[PDB]
């Protein structure tokens, strides 16, 4: 059991990395789209407001 | 992006205002000087009777 834990805290280590990963890429992709939209949005607005 | 919405928004609209008001100072003297002119021989027909 000993050494499965040596081999398993390196498994550990790689998990909190591609947890990390599926985080942040989930969250980045959807606060993006909405910058996106609210961009395109405001860019429109100048132009309807004039 | 907003700020630039509102700056043409209030430019369109004070360029409306100040119209509307340089016609309604017009009129409203206008107005007055015909209130003043019926006061004043109004007034002086009570005066001569």
Redesign the interface.
């Given at each position: 059991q000993s050494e499965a834990e040596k081999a398993r805290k390196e498994l550990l280590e790689l998990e909190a990395l591609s947890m990390a990963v599926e985080s942040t890429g989930t969250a980045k992709a959807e606060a993006e789209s909405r910058a996106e939209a609210a961009?395109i949005e405001?860019?429109g607005?100048?132009l309807?407001?004039? | 992006?907003?700020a630039?919405?509102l700056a043409?928004?209030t430019e369109?609209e004070l360029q409306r205002v100040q119209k509307v008001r340089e016609l309604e100072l017009v009129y409203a003297r206008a107005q007055l000087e015909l209130e003043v002119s019926k006061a004043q021989q109004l007034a002086e027909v009570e005066v001569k009777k």
């Open positions: 961009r405001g860019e607005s100048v309807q407001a004039k | 992006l907003k630039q919405a043409i928004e369109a």
